[PDB]
Design an enzyme around this catalytic site. Structure first.
Site, mmCIF file in Angstrom:
data_model
loop_
_atom_site.group_PDB
_atom_site.id
_atom_site.type_symbol
_atom_site.label_atom_id
_atom_site.label_comp_id
_atom_site.label_asym_id
_atom_site.label_seq_id
_atom_site.Cartn_x
_atom_site.Cartn_y
_atom_site.Cartn_z
ATOM 1 C CG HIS A 45 14.863 14.205 25.299
ATOM 2 N ND1 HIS A 45 15.008 14.200 23.929
ATOM 3 C CD2 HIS A 45 15.114 15.468 25.684
ATOM 4 C CE1 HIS A 45 15.324 15.422 23.507
ATOM 5 N NE2 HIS A 45 15.389 16.213 24.556
ATOM 6 N N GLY A 60 18.171 23.683 25.096
ATOM 7 C CA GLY A 60 16.829 24.243 25.219
ATOM 8 C C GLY A 60 16.082 24.336 23.880
ATOM 9 C CB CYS A 105 14.937 19.459 22.428
ATOM 10 S SG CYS A 105 16.607 18.770 22.264
HETATM 11 C C1 LIG Z 1 17.757 19.356 23.460
HETATM 12 C C2 LIG Z 1 16.889 19.317 24.519
HETATM 13 C C3 LIG Z 1 17.029 18.722 25.925
HETATM 14 O O1 LIG Z 1 16.312 17.861 26.326
HETATM 15 N N1 LIG Z 1 18.069 19.305 26.834
HETATM 16 C C4 LIG Z 1 18.277 18.851 28.145
HETATM 17 C C5 LIG Z 1 19.454 19.555 28.804
HETATM 18 N N2 LIG Z 1 19.346 20.973 28.717
HETATM 19 C C6 LIG Z 1 18.680 21.495 29.682
HETATM 20 C C7 LIG Z 1 19.632 21.430 30.912
HETATM 21 C C8 LIG Z 1 20.113 22.774 31.178
HETATM 22 C C9 LIG Z 1 20.959 22.786 32.438
HETATM 23 N N3 LIG Z 1 20.250 21.986 33.539
HETATM 24 C C10 LIG Z 1 19.420 22.666 34.481
HETATM 25 C C11 LIG Z 1 18.370 23.278 33.821
HETATM 26 C C12 LIG Z 1 17.454 23.993 34.588
HETATM 27 C C13 LIG Z 1 17.586 24.092 35.956
HETATM 28 C C14 LIG Z 1 18.676 23.460 36.651
HETATM 29 C C15 LIG Z 1 19.602 22.741 35.899
HETATM 30 F F1 LIG Z 1 20.651 22.135 36.558
HETATM 31 C C16 LIG Z 1 16.486 24.871 36.387
HETATM 32 O O2 LIG Z 1 16.303 25.155 37.552
HETATM 33 N N4 LIG Z 1 15.752 25.194 35.255
HETATM 34 C C17 LIG Z 1 14.547 26.022 35.138
HETATM 35 C C18 LIG Z 1 15.047 27.227 34.432
HETATM 36 C C19 LIG Z 1 16.269 27.665 35.151
HETATM 37 C C20 LIG Z 1 15.944 27.938 36.585
HETATM 38 O O3 LIG Z 1 16.563 28.756 37.090
HETATM 39 N N5 LIG Z 1 14.795 27.219 37.291
HETATM 40 C C21 LIG Z 1 14.081 26.185 36.589
HETATM 41 O O4 LIG Z 1 13.347 25.505 37.221
HETATM 42 C C22 LIG Z 1 16.299 24.691 34.156
HETATM 43 O O5 LIG Z 1 15.919 24.790 32.998
HETATM 44 C C23 LIG Z 1 19.848 20.575 33.151
HETATM 45 C C24 LIG Z 1 18.913 20.708 31.973
HETATM 46 C C25 LIG Z 1 18.906 21.469 27.495
HETATM 47 C C26 LIG Z 1 18.951 20.376 26.447
HETATM 48 C C27 LIG Z 1 19.287 19.037 23.375
HETATM 49 C C28 LIG Z 1 19.744 19.231 21.849
HETATM 50 C C29 LIG Z 1 21.295 19.270 21.612
HETATM 51 C C30 LIG Z 1 21.596 19.453 19.987
HETATM 52 C C31 LIG Z 1 21.448 20.689 19.745
HETATM 53 N N6 LIG Z 1 22.100 21.352 20.985
HETATM 54 C C32 LIG Z 1 21.901 20.284 22.150
HETATM 55 O O6 LIG Z 1 22.291 20.411 23.288
HETATM 56 N N7 LIG Z 1 19.599 17.735 24.074
HETATM 57 C C33 LIG Z 1 19.979 16.502 23.382
HETATM 58 O O7 LIG Z 1 20.078 16.503 22.216
HETATM 59 C C34 LIG Z 1 20.261 15.178 24.156
HETATM 60 C C35 LIG Z 1 18.972 14.290 24.194
HETATM 61 C C36 LIG Z 1 19.160 13.037 25.135
HETATM 62 C C37 LIG Z 1 19.726 11.811 24.372
HETATM 63 C C38 LIG Z 1 17.873 12.665 25.912
HETATM 64 N N8 LIG Z 1 21.378 14.413 23.469
HETATM 65 C C39 LIG Z 1 22.593 15.182 22.992
HETATM 66 O O8 LIG Z 1 22.535 15.792 21.955
HETATM 67 O O9 LIG Z 1 23.765 15.154 23.793
HETATM 68 C C40 LIG Z 1 24.992 15.281 23.123
HETATM 69 C C41 LIG Z 1 25.291 16.778 22.924
HETATM 70 C C42 LIG Z 1 24.745 17.764 23.779
HETATM 71 C C43 LIG Z 1 25.039 19.105 23.582
HETATM 72 C C44 LIG Z 1 25.876 19.511 22.543
HETATM 73 C C45 LIG Z 1 26.419 18.528 21.682
HETATM 74 C C46 LIG Z 1 26.132 17.182 21.869
#
Ligand SMILES: */C(=C/C(=O)N1CCN(CC2CCN(c3cc4c(cc3F)C(=O)N([C@@H]3CCC(=O)NC3=O)C4=O)CC2)CC1)[C@H](C[C@H]1CCNC1=O)NC(=O)[C@@H](CC(C)C)NC(=O)OCc1ccccc1
Ligand SMILES: */C(=C/C(=O)N1CCN(CC2CCN(c3cc4c(cc3F)C(=O)N([C@@H]3CCC(=O)NC3=O)C4=O)CC2)CC1)[C@H](C[C@H]1CCNC1=O)NC(=O)[C@@H](CC(C)C)NC(=O)OCc1ccccc1
Lengths: 306, 306
Positions: B41, B143, B145
């Site tokens: 993902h 972050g 994952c």
């Molecule tokens: C584990 C991992 C995962 O895949 N993700 C994806 C989302 N997130 C990253 C986000 C952060 C905000 N965002 C973003 C990021 C970045 C930029 C812009 C932007 F809009 C950006 O420019 N950059 C870099 C660094 C910053 C920068 O200035 N320049 C760059 O180029 C960015 O990084 C979009 C992306 C992090 C998470 C999680 C695990 C969860 C459980 C534990 N805590 C969690 O959140 N994701 C999942 O589990 C998710 C998987 C999907 C089914 C594919 N499912 C989920 O758990 O959702 C329900 C949930 C979510 C959170 C809490 C509780 C339930």
């Protein structure tokens, strides 16, 4: 989300653990630059430990009576000296894995990671608080002495604990890395009392804030209180008295959750007086006091180490 | 003495953590030999995650769309492929810190260490059990994952978990290192139920044995029971049914404490039916089921790692 007792990554400290033998006693030492630190009681026999005269005992020991082993490599000991309750063994080789580091003497109520070791080999890592009475509640078997406790600030290891003893109550006692005990303990096998073990009120409050952040909320009531009022209830339950310093430290969490610290105090008070009614908070059926405000913020901001 | 939830030393796994970026998603990868493993993902946008077609999504990605960073060094990606829910990124460099390792798929009720990471930087280490319903109760933020779980047998790291998701109940879900989820979960942002969370009866019994070993004994009563009798009481409390396999596994502890397993069952039964009466066992006010018989023996024999 979610909230767990979490130790720092132990890689940087693993590279510093060695085995120190003197006569027939073996324990752990910490190898930083060209010095190995270990408990001075490595020089004691089982009989000695009842009433040791360390100065007289050490006088019989030469550099060659100390065997230091890193894995399978024997370090050559070119000097020794006693600093308080620690022995300092100078070796001919600087540890090539010495991290950036400090010695610090932590304050009661603060937390740190223990890397439990046997024979200079890491066994496991867990989190401890220096309790108000200067004990810790750890997991230590024979051969575990010389195991250290530490914190990391990015790349700097701050060493704060070396394990020396278990008291009759089953809790643990030890020194900073300058060999000064936490608490009124001595490195002798005799009955020793830690005072009353009080609860780290500020820590409990941080954990309640953590609970609120992780969605645990039954316990939030509708009352507030005063510092003096709460403290009259703290003392009755052997809680540490709360100060404006503590309030300020909780300020970030209070500001994030929107719960005034004194409201959280009122809720804690009712928790203390009415118990938990068979409920749980962040998966525990009692009030946890081994998470600092810093420990909970860390685990809500996602701070990493390098 | 003393008994604590203890993670394995994390040094060998720290050396394998890297940062994987694809488009604007960044997460952690595990770098062993010349391959980097991460959740597939990583290729999703926030919008994608509601209903991803991974096969179609991956088709748009080339080797160069994947940025892998170890500290400040960028690894060159020379191949990619999807194995179940994991992406495998082939790089031009073998990790010079690759430990001896295995991929294993652990069984429900077993335990393992999590090294929580952000941006490919270790944050902290804690201990988890694969619950009977194939979730874990961990501490995971955005972050995190790609963070992995593992066990060590002396010098061999056995990788068993990679973090992918949090369910609506606040618990956590993920895959083995072949990318197969534990439980009935999918890597999509939709409401997902884990079944009833049952208690790992054998683990609770091991912990009661641990308590006995550490001198906790009020709970020892004068009754015994039968396997079928206890199990009729287990099911009522959503405890896992106990089998002769479980009895045999507890055999060493039973033999050491002199307490027949079925006597400990009788004591557990009364614990279940009468509660703890405001008492504590090894410092907890509820029954702990995240210590395996192996976890307690480890912590009573002083097993070390190299
Ligand atoms: C584990 C991992 C995962 O895949 N993700 C994806 C989302 N997130 C990253 C986000 C952060 C905000 N965002 C973003 C990021 C970045 C930029 C812009 C932007 F809009 C950006 O420019 N950059 C870099 C660094 C910053 C920068 O200035 N320049 C760059 O180029 C960015 O990084 C979009 C992306 C992090 C998470 C999680 C695990 C969860 C459980 C534990 N805590 C969690 O959140 N994701 C999942 O589990 C998710 C998987 C999907 C089914 C594919 N499912 C989920 O758990 O959702 C329900 C949930 C979510 C959170 C809490 C509780 C339930
Ligand atoms: C921390 C460290 C410490 O200094 N010791 C010292 C005693 N012990 C080592 C023992 C082990 C048995 N024994 C012995 C050892 C060895 C040989 C022979 C022998 F008779 C021997 O030949 N070798 C090597 C390896 C084996 C071999 O085959 N050949 C060799 O050459 C031996 O190693 C004598 C030495 C280990 C502990 C502890 C910390 C305690 C708290 C946590 N768990 C603890 O036990 N010691 C103390 O804390 C102690 C310090 C003194 C005041 C100086 N005080 C104390 O805590 O005592 C009360 C207590 C003790 C245990 C439990 C609870 C309370």
């Amino acid at each position: 989300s979610g909230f767990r007792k979490m130790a720092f990554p132990s890689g940087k400290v693993e590279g510093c653990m060695v085995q120190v033998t003197c006569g027939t006693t073996t324990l752990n030492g910490l190898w930083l630059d060209d010095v190995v630190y270990c408990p001075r009681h490595v020089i004691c026999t089982s009989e000695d430990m009842l009433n040791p005269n360390y100065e007289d005992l050490l006088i019989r020991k030469s550099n060659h009576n100390f065997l230091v082993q890193a894995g399978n490599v024997q370090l050559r000991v070119i000097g020794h000296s006693m600093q308080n309750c620690v022995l300092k063994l100078k070796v001919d080789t600087a540890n090539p894995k010495t991290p950036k580091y400090k010695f610090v003497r932590i304050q009661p109520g603060q937390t740190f990671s223990v890397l439990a070791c046997y024979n200079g080999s890491p066994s496991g890592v867990y989190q401890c608080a220096m309790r108000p009475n200067f004990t810790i509640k750890g997991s230590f078997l024979n051969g575990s002495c010389g195991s250290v406790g530490f914190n990391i600030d990015y790349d700097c290891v701050s060493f704060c604990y070396m394990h020396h003893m278990e008291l009759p109550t089953g809790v643990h006692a030890g020194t900073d890395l300058e060999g000064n005990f936490y608490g009124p303990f001595v490195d002798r096998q005799t009955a020793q009392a830690a005072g009353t073990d009080t609860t780290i009120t500020v820590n409990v409050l941080a954990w309640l804030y953590a609970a609120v952040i992780n969605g645990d909320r039954w316990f939030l009531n509708r009352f507030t209180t005063t510092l003096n009022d709460f403290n009259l209830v703290a003392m009755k339950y052997n809680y540490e008295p709360l100060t404006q310093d503590h309030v300020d430290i909780l300020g970030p969490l209070s500001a994030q959750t929107g719960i005034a610290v004194l409201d959280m105090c009122a809720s804690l008070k009712e928790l203390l007086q009415n118990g938990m009614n068979g409920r749980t908070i962040l998966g525990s059926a009692l009030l946890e006091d081994e998470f600092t405000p810093f420990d909970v913020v860390r685990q809500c901001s996602g701070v990493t180490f390098q």
